Amino acid sequence: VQGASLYCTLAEDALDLHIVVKSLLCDTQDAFFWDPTVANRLDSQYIQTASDLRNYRDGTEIIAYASGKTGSVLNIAVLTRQNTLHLNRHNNVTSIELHSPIKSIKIPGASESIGRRSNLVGIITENSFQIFRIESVHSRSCDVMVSSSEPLYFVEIDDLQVVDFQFAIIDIKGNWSIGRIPKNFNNQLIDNLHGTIFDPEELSSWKRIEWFSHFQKILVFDRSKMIEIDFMNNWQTEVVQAKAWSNIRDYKRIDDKNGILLTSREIIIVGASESNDPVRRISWKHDLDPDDTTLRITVQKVKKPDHILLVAFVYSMRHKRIYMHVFSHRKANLFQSLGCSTVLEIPGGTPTGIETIFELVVDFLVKLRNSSEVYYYALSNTQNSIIVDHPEWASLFNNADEREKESIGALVSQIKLKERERISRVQNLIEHENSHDEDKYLQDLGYRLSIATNELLESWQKTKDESILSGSLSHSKLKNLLENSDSFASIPEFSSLLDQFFQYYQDQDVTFIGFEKLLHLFLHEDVPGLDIFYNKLLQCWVLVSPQAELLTKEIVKDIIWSLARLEKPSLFEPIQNEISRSLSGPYQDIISSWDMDD
Amino acid sequence: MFEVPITLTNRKFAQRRKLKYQYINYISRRFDRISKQQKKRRRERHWRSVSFEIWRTVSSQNKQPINKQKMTYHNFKKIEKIPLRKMEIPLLHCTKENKLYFQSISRGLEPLKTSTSEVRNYRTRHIVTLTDLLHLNVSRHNWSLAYKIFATLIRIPGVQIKSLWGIGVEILDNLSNSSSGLDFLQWMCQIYSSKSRSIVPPFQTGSRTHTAKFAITYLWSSLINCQKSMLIDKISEWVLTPPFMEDAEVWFIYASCHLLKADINQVIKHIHYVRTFLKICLDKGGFAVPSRLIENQLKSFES
Amino acid sequence: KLIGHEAKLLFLKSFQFILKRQIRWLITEMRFPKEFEHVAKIIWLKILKTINDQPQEELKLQLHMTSTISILYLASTHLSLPVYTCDYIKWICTAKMPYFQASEILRIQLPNYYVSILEGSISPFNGQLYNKIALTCGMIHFKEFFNSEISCQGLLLKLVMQCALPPEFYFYTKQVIEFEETDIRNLTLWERTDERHTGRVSNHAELRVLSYFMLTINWMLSFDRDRQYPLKWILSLTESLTQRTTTSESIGRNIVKVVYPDKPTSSDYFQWSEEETLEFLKWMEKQFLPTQTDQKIARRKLYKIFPLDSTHQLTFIEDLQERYAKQTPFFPPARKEAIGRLLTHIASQLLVDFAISKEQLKDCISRIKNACLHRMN
Ligand SMILES: [Mg+2]
């Protein structure tokens, strides 16, 4: 719109989105809050040693990631990229043990202007700040021998937020220092230019130093504001917004020197100079929508003939979703935006590190909350071409000892042969359907049960005047004759038995419960007949099991029995204890007891 | 996982705001000493500044030089030691979850539960899922579904309209039926440009000083509804109508209407016209390309 | 204006009134029996008599909504109806059975102390329901006064059909059930306190039923030395279970997924199909008319600017039939994987459906699994 009709309304392009390509790379209060001083515990970037500067070889790609029970060891090892990025063939990770937990690791890289690339990688612990030289990796076996540019435990008993980079720059909560690293061996790192951005009314601990233009001028951040500091003169500026409606959420230098990517809350900010002197950009921006404190960002930078476009990954610690926007650098210092897109990932947890390195391919690594794995991902535009270890449930399914294997197998055999007994047993009962034998059985069954039911009704007459409760004892049953249930095997004549039993005990003060309206809960549609119940279940299972007729009959029998009513003497007996308990209660709770409201 | 268009559940977040700004008061007070209530939160949040047409910012020059270390461990804990007990008093009145909250923000930790993520009431959690599905579908080009989401959402009694860009790009890419994004935008401007705090950032605003988003977007988008043409003297008729003189961007909208109408002495008057509104658009925070894209077009016109 | 210090009467009146309101909706719209009402007057009568045998003007009563549902389930279980807690959770989370509003918007102005005593403790979703029904089961005693045996076998059926298991697993799980218990299932887990730390994660009958169910599937399937259940059909079972389709049930479980405390289930609303989202907005304009709480007509025309707006979706036994057919092709160590993903999906469904925790469930099936290993070894 802006340029299309400044020149003289849809977009510039059609509608294209996200796809994946996955791979494994390497393996290694608090419930409601998090420490901002722990940014990222793994980096991977192009490094270049001295022996790489004798030739024209462009160094190598390395990863450095933290490890340990207490996360207090550094691991540095080389990568080789072929079909997809992968760890070196000889897998000789070079790990060095510290005694302090690692809070932040970053390998600095260098500008294109210097010709060289970084020779070092630096770390902030809970106790110290150290810089490591990588000196002379060699292909004899893919070794990465490193040296320990010496720690400085503390000068101020202060934790340090961010390190930026030859210039070791530190930020501790409010106050910063520019410093330098020793050359190779064995004098350690010193400083002489210092400052502070302290702000009593910002409680969150994270601040951040990353400089700008390579002009030898720095940026210092807290969740309240963004301060530029031209630090080889004397210069300081609070750039134009402050702390009114949003917090600075992250900032990372979009890799090209004069380029700045800042997550606020609900805004992706592309700062970057369009003047040799440092800048702000209010070249308009996009916005992204939460209250989440835990948002971070990274950019990948892809090159093309007519533009130079940047992909912005904003990720969280709450949900494994990644939120992506795309910008473009047509170097008239032209910036435009196109439309949003978001992807998910997998079960419980969330990103602790996202790190980047007519279609778009953008590739990176992720590390998830509380999972030592490091996964390489790749993303493409179109399509022209769970492995469960939930240790909570496997610990519940795989139980250890061998007698706890053959124990389970023993029980399984017990029930399996029992099931054979069920099949062979009921079979002949199915052979007799509509027989005169099953008729005899439904007769002497129905009214045998009628005799027992009457007996239990007499022994309900003797205890009738209880009036303390209103639920008769062990009521609803076949009433202590159990063999009489099973032996039949014809659902409709059995439903007719029950209908004529309910009919028979219509002599009042007896329970009434209509089954159909309750099978409603079983099949989730009106089940008028006790038979149609059997029909529907039999369709379903006749698709799936042999003797589905026998089981379905045995289970509609089992259900119809499990629900076979015979509760306390009916409605006229409950009102007795109803009123009599509504008596022993004090008089005005008795006045509050209220039927038929409105 | 998206912003909700409802006022936030009230009880606990407000008393946390209390504890926060009250402790902030005590620490910053004693800090200025060493350098020598909703209303407490109110004063506290108070004393503080509250080649293409880039509404440029204010860059770096005329700003004061430096500061060198103010805060060692001992000195900070000097400033911190006392205001924390003062906090020990009303911490005893607030709830335990907000005790632990205050202790953690005052340790410097940050909460990883959002205000949304802990509202946990039926209706609001449902609205959260609804709004989410709106934002998702709008990302997914599913303008049909997204439209159903939007209508069902605005139906609900709690949602006031941040969602206007949602519907702007929504009906824009919809093309389907309903009175389109221009209709909606000029509606937003007609209803919310007259008198006729908590909830209000800048993408919905009051007509004292700049009502931003919707106005400039119906302005430009209407000039693009002239890109449909080659209506203009209409758009600059009702850009001529309002006095809101600081509105420089509407001065560049004005001069753009005159350049688009300039594409005989009438065309002359239109070219002198745009020549004028460009400088009365140098009145305010500049939208500039140069003088040559401004004029060189007008000399290709002077042909 | 509003009562002071003896609005115990008004409190118990809005409470009792809300109860009979819910009963009206379940005999009416759920085709319950009329006897349920009298059983409810008896149980609510017993605990009403017990709180009005308590003295203090300090109320000390907690008539939360969990007590309403608690006496509904208590009475239903006495009457041996095949309704289970998950029926209730579904019924209330889908706004069908009125629940979430103390006298929903339309009533009475009570002391804000009691309005809070109602709106508070509203959720059932961490087993609050099981704990509140055992608590009521102490408050007035289950044993002599009522018959607190659960309707076990219909829950087995409910469960096999809820998966797509062949009807053998009804008798399987029924048999492991008889094996550890011999079928005796209680309702109290009460020793009035908050304190508990062993023996009493697993003594709500249902949760043990689910535990036996899961266990059964794992054992049974991982020891079919017959090879009765193919290495594949466990996969096809998992997939027919996984295919998000639009029946009243699955749509419901989505609606419950929305108000379940823990992720993932909300990531599950993230992954809804277009038809799921559509039937969702349908349920929104239908059952969020049960909402709560010049320019007004300007917003009737304003909202009337954009439209407020042969049965396609199939029934329950239709879907059930069709996945039973989707596996109808019925007639080596990485099959344990199939076992495990099936078990974890089934688990997921049970966690949302029976409003408990991941950790709760696995605690119970862990305990009762060692409770079968112990009576097996
Ligand atoms: Mg400021």
Swiss-Prot record, chain A:
GO process terms (BP): nucleolar large rRNA transcription by RNA polymerase I; transcription initiation at RNA polymerase I promoter
Superkingdom classification of source: Eukaryota
Pfam families referenced in this protein's UniProt entry, alphabetically: Rrn6_beta-prop, Rrn6_HB, Rrn6_K-rich
Compartments (UniProt record): Cytoplasm; Nucleus, Nucleolus
GO molecular function, one term: RNA polymerase I general transcription initiation factor binding
Keyword Transcription: yes
InterPro entries xrefs: RNA_pol_I-sp_TIF_RRN6-like, Rrn6, RRN6_beta-prop, RRN6_HB, Rrn6_K-rich
Keywords of the record: Cytoplasm, Nucleus, Transcription, Transcription regulation
Other noteworthy facts: Present with 237 molecules/cell in log phase SD medium.
Subunit structure: Component of the core factor (CF) complex, which consists of RRN6, RRN7 and RRN11. The CF heterotrimer may further dimerize to form a hexamer. RRN6 interacts with RRN7, RRN11 and RRN9.
Functional summary from the UniProt entry: Acts as a component of the core factor (CF) complex which is essential for the initiation of rDNA transcription by RNA polymerase I. After binding of UAF (upstream activation factor) to an upstream element of the promoter, CF is recruited in a SPT15/TBP-dependent manner to form a preinitiation complex.
Protein's UniProt name: RNA polymerase I-specific transcription initiation factor RRN6
Annotated source species: Saccharomyces cerevisiae (strain ATCC 204508 / S288c)
The gene coding this protein: RRN6
Curated annotation (Swiss-Prot), chain B:
This protein's UniProt keywords: Nucleus, Transcription, Transcription regulation
Organism name: Saccharomyces cerevisiae (strain ATCC 204508 / S288c)
Main location: nucleus
Name of the protein described by the UniProt record: RNA polymerase I-specific transcription initiation factor RRN11
Biological process according to GO: nucleolar large rRNA transcription by RNA polymerase I
Function summary: Acts as a component of the core factor (CF) complex which is essential for the initiation of rDNA transcription by RNA polymerase I. After binding of UAF (upstream activation factor) to an upstream element of the promoter, CF is recruited in a SPT15/TBP-dependent manner to form a preinitiation complex.
UniProt-recorded Gene Ontology molecular function terms: RNA polymerase I core promoter sequence-specific DNA binding; RNA polymerase I general transcription initiation factor activity; TBP-class protein binding
UniProt-annotated location(s): Nucleus, Nucleolus
Note: Present with 476 molecules/cell in log phase SD medium.
Record's keyword annotation contains Hydrolase: no
One cellular component (GO) term of this entry: nucleus
Transmembrane segments: none
InterPro entries listed in its UniProt record: RNA_pol_I-specific_init_factor, TIF_Rrn11, TIF_Rrn11_budding_yeast
Oligomeric form and interacting partners: Component of the core factor (CF) complex, which consists of RRN6, RRN7 and RRN11. The CF heterotrimer may further dimerize to form a hexamer. RRN11 interacts with RRN6, RRN7 and SPT15.
Keyword GTP-binding: no
Curated annotation (Swiss-Prot), chain C:
Gene Ontology biological-process entries: nucleolar large rRNA transcription by RNA polymerase I
Cellular-component GO terms for this entry: nucleolus; nucleus; RNA polymerase I core factor complex
Subcellular locations according to the entry: Nucleus, Nucleolus
Entry keyword DNA-binding: yes
SUBUNIT field: Component of the core factor (CF) complex, which consists of RRN6, RRN7 and RRN11. The CF heterotrimer may further dimerize to form a hexamer. RRN7 interacts with RRN6, RRN11, SPT15 and RRN9.
Domain notes: Although it shares weak sequence similarity with SUA7/TFIIB, displays a similar subdomain organization as SUA7/TFIIB, with a N-terminal zinc finger, a connecting region (composed of B-reader and B-linker regions), followed by 2 cyclin folds.
Full protein name: RNA polymerase I-specific transcription initiation factor RRN7
Source species: Saccharomyces cerevisiae (strain ATCC 204508 / S288c) (Baker's yeast)
Residue range from the parent sequence: 94 to 514 of 514
